[PDB]
Symmetry: C2
Subunit: 125 residues, 2 copies
């Protein structure tokens, strides 16, 4: 339940850390929330549109051996497979904010929305 801040110093085995968070320029732009779980877990939240609060969020519940990843748009949360494709795309989004080229950011965020709207949870029958 405690929401520390350190992530630039210490190290993790946690995939989402050593593959997205640490690889993002200026985390504080996206007003990150990071908490410690009991010590066996990490619960991460990043705003995708920091300007409009909780409009578009990325959430990652990490545990000892398991990770669960969720895109959330206007209050509707969808789970998505935690994999490279997602890590990358997430980096494309967050690493794309440049004041001298907002339109580029605009687009890649739209790219992620598309992914959001395109997610289906399927089984092999």
């Amino acid at each position: 339940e405690v929401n520390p801040d350190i992530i630039k110093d210490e190290v993790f085995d946690f995939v989402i850390v050593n593959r997205v968070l640490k690889k993002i320029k200026d985390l504080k732009h996206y007003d990150p929330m990071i908490e410690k779980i009991f010590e066996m877990g990490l619960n991460v939240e990043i705003q995708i549109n920091p300007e409009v609060k909780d409009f578009f969020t990325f959430k990652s519940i990490s545990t000892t051996n398991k990770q669960r990843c969720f895109l959330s748009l206007r209050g509707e949360t969808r789970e998505i497979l935690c994999d490279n494709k997602l890590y990358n795309m997430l980096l494309a989004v967050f690493n794309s904010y440049d004041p001298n080229d907002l339109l580029k950011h605009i687009s890649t965020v739209e790219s992620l929305k598309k992914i959001f709207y395109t997610i289906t949870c399927e089984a092999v029958y």
Copy 2:
């Protein structure tokens, strides 16, 4: 908020109601938890293994034109696409029940487990 019980009385436009819930012969055996939402929606929860409360359940959230379906195993909840495949598997599970011969039923429940472990939430990148 409120929770009825006779899915045989009222008529519904809810698709989970007409494609599944009304076609279940011994609905009562599966300890249904059916609530109405602000009329506007239906919250449904069925026990796949009534013998072990909340071990394996199916949840369905219906609002006006939307439905979301979940399978929960040992407290782990996964969303699953509400499609014909889904509706056919569930009916096969709830209607295979026969107190005078349960092997068929025991096996189809396993078939639903297999489905659970198989679910993935993917987006096309």
